Symmetry: C6
Subunit: 215 residues, 6 copies
């Protein structure tokens, strides 16, 4: 990544063994549960495009997902080039060239070039731009791997209301990849006894009040 | 987070893998036992609003609780805006804008803006303000998930007094989310034999003296 | 905590995840065995009162003990105020106020105020003063939870002398919370065969010589 | 490795116990699954040739693979010498000598010499050149150890499409050591029921659309 | 401990959680096997007397050993005072006082005083002096807890020579607490068949040659 | 060890708990498998002779090996003294004395003296010289503990060629302690069916080609 040192200058640092292991382990343990995305975002803080590829490449399983991600990345890179045409020809000696999509994704740019862009004034934040494309792709994967429609999250006869709502909002998060009348659906999908109580509370009731009421 | 370096300047640092993992693990192991809150507060030392959202977002379970927390945050943000109206219109070029509720909660502000506020002189401590809203919400969740009324904590016939008092004060802490005649209730809820001894001690007895007496 | 940086200035640093976890784990594994106290003292090196409360608050069990500790802290704070009366009224603008007991215990003081006192010249060491009150309270808890009188530590007929003395001095440590004719009691509580040998050695024998003799 | 310090100078640092252990453990757990290569590349960030040999030498198993790697390294070193002949004879006193293949591979060069080349202006990046030779060799090993032809990855009658595609693209990655009408082969190797659905989608369908269709 | 910072000045640093845990764990796992002593010496690198007491105090078991250690420390402290009499009376204002035995052992000196001595020019190395007394005491404990005389280490009829010599030199190390015609005793204690071979080798044979011969 | 700080000066640093534990654990898990030596070399990067003795002394088992190592060290030290006679008599006040063998091995030199030599200009690299003697001794131990002659590594009738070659080159490494017509022996020791195939390939075949051929 690129970070500021003790002196107060933006410099390249090697990706740490702890960061590398943390990412590999969260994917192994959580697959593409929605909470994997903010972990990725946090673990890749200050990442160069090279670092982002490193993280994605260290993942051993889920190769269908990784292929889908590559497709998303390629789509975002093509769109970048459409919006930002770079002039062809030889580079001005010793000067910074303009990044293409494939340079942002780290396929055609060097670490040195990436550092050059990210530490320029003003910065051309290729790490952040690429991370946005990656997260866009990861959100599609999260939605793909969400196993259940919210329509099928219904409270069991003996299921505690707390456990039901945990399943309900877990499912909403996966189905929408953490992107924000669900309270109405929550009541509709509740079991008969809790549903009666929730109807009596009326509209405008908070989740807190509903939980208290069916507790 | 924002910390002071070796040179003595307040700078942004990436949230560490160790911090991220620690928070995820304490929630996995302790759910919303009262001691989770001071751990959150300590692990989020110097946190930007972005960091606070990262920590909350890395939590995979407990989505009913997280939805309740969002409601609390939205309430505190609306109240902030009522007390602190920001003037609409274009920003003075190159100048710091005033934070709205949604900027404090990190939904409408950038990391750069957050850094700007928190390192300004004087600091506009958006990380600390948001953390206060979050802890307020977490305390409600702790009280919600407290499984037992203090009225139902009673010493068993063969239960050691020490074990009884551990249950008693554990329950008080959960019921009040660690926010401070309970000594009287403690005696009332004691078993017959210990209760007789505690009555003989009289009023003004310390917990230490009571424990000695029923030991 | 407050520490000196590379440059050589006393600055605030966030309490580390490793420190937080270490304290929580030693309490989980050792409860209030005497060796927990020096671990607490070492892990809270340079701690502000806020840090000390953080450490105590992260403990989930042992709430009877924690309530006893609060009583000790309140007693020491009242005594502080009796010995050190602070003048009431408005503070001199921009000047350091005098700490009351509740400020030392971190209930009525801010982190900024705590930093101000601890880094003043000369320092008003509120972290160290509070830690002393806490350790005083923890020592009472260690003595409370010591399960056995030294009178009941007696060598078994087939018990190796080494194992007996380990139990003996372990018990002395707990009963006195590591605060320093026990050699005589050690002999009295020894089994018949070892006792005869130890009597023959006579007075002035070291523990080393006694162990050799009954080995 | 060679890294830049807080002051902003390129200096040698000892390889860390965490780096050493991470590499040894990933080889123990993953052997030569394709994802081992980008982990190697990341863990050897800034590595001197000495560091690269250290990492390779700490591996206890897989000695057939390590012998193959040595052969690749020797081939790349011979080619280097063919392209870059070094003038024989005594060195100019106190001056930098030109690296031969065996100097790049760290068999005939000292750490001091390696540091000299890598921190020269311009740098003669012997660590990076050697790492390229090593990765070239590791890719051959990955392809050697790939256990299955893509021709034999076929969807089972009851196998979920997601699981089939995971096997498919895992195999492509191994067979090509992560070096980029497979969508056509993917359809051909699908089971009858999914194959019919995929034919109806027609050409130009994304993996995402195919997965949706056979989900 | 006292260490030199990045700037190059000798300053106090808090003992680390990793150091504290390492010492506690090595004692738990190895008791007073001889190799515990050099681990103690290494983990207490740069330790103040306060740090040394912290390490010793964090040990929960082995209280007979710890009492023996205290006796050794008290003996060494009395001898220090005999050799180095300190002048009684009031201290020169703002000046360094001379350390007594109890000051070196950290019972009557403050951390500040300890820092003062250890960073003075020339340094009065109270940490190193105390560590010497402690190691002297630990060596006595190692010898006390050595379970077997070298006279009873004899090669079994079917015991491999390598395993026999491991037991032999392990025992010598414990019996002498790692303080350096044992080759003759090694032969005498060997089994008949190996003994015959070793006699044929004659005198002046190395351990290496003996091992080869009975292999 | 001796390392360069942030400022760029060579200073002593305490050996880390992580380094100490890593070495102890690799010996516990791997004994004297050949890969232990490069781990030792890497973990002792920048080590003083004191540090090297610390590492060797923290090893609890394998005392026969450690005694053999001491013999090798004593041999190398005697040879050093033969080649480098030091003038006897009093030292020039405040000046650096010349290291003898026993000073290089850290038996008769202080840490201060060791630091003096290693940071002198030019450096007298006593840490590196001693490490060379130690590795020479460790290589002898690796060869001693190598359990099998390469003559007895033969491919089983049903043993996969890959597994056979792993055993073959593992054995060569141990027998030669990683110090570099074995391809011919590899073929001779192959099973009948693979041997026939390998003969047909002819001379000059790479290991890669042989593996392919018998795969
Ligand atoms: C955790 C979660 N569950 C969801 C369900 C549907 C849609 C989105 C989500 C999210 C992500 C989610 O909304 N996370 C929150 C942070 C958060 C997490 C957990 C509790 C409270 C606040 C967030 O990122 N932002 C910007 C936010 C902050 C305050 C209010 C609203 C949004
Ligand atoms: C741990 C605990 N149990 C409770 C029961 C009811 C209400 C609150 C609580 C708390 C939190 C609790 O009160 N924690 C204490 C710190 C503490 C923790 C444990 C032992 C001693 C001191 C705290 O945060 N503060 C500010 C405090 C400090 C001194 C006296 C009184 C309060
Ligand atoms: C460990 C222990 N057991 C005890 C039994 C009764 C009373 C107190 C204790 C203690 C604490 C205990 O006395 N710890 C010792 C340090 C120590 C620990 C272990 C072995 C040697 C030295 C200590 O803190 N100090 C100041 C000390 C130092 C030297 C001599 C006497 C006291
Ligand atoms: C992970 C993987 N599977 C493959 C199958 C066949 C050939 C190569 C591969 C690779 C390596 C692979 O291609 N990894 C990607 C990074 C990556 C990994 C995972 C998901 C998305 C992006 C990479 O290194 N680069 C340079 C890249 C970046 C964007 C688009 C295309 C390539
Ligand atoms: C490890 C060990 N076994 C012993 C048996 C009897 C007496 C002492 C011991 C020791 C401690 C022991 O002697 N350790 C060695 C270091 C060492 C450890 C292991 C192998 C090689 C060198 C040591 O500390 N020093 C100063 C030393 C160095 C070179 C030669 C002789 C002594
Ligand atoms: C790992 C190994 N197996 C052996 C068998 C017989 C003799 C020696 C060995 C070694 C040590 C071994 O040779 N290790 C290699 C590094 C290495 C390790 C593994 C794969 C590729 C390169 C090494 O240290 N050097 C200097 C080296 C580098 C390039 C070519 C030749 C030698």
């Amino acid at each position: 990544p690129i970070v500021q040192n003790l002196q107060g200058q933006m410099v390249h640092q090697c990706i740490s063994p702890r960061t590398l292991n943390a990412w590999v382990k969260v994917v192994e343990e959580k697959a593409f549960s929605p909470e994997v995305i903010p972990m990725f975002a946090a673990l890749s803080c200050g990442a160069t495009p090279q670092d982002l590829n490193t993280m994605l490449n260290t993942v051993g399983g889920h190769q269908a997902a990784m292929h889908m991600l590559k497709e998303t990345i390629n789509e975002e890179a093509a769109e970048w080039d459409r919006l930002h045409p770079v002039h062809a020809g030889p580079i001005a000696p010793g000067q910074m060239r303009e990044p293409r999509g494939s340079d942002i994704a780290g396929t055609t740019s060097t670490l040195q070039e990436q550092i050059g862009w990210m530490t320029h004034n003003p910065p051309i934040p290729v790490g952040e731009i690429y991370k946005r494309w990656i997260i866009l792709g990861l959100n599609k994967i999260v939605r793909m791997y969400s196993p259940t429609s919210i329509l099928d999250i219904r409270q069991g006869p003996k299921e505690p209301f707390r456990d039901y709502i945990d399943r309900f909002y877990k499912t909403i998060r996966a189905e929408q990849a953490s992107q924000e009348a669900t309270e109405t659906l929550l009541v509709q999908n509740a079991n008969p006894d809790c549903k009666t109580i929730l109807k009596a509370l009326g509209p405008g009731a908070t989740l807190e009040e509903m939980m208290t009421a069916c507790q």
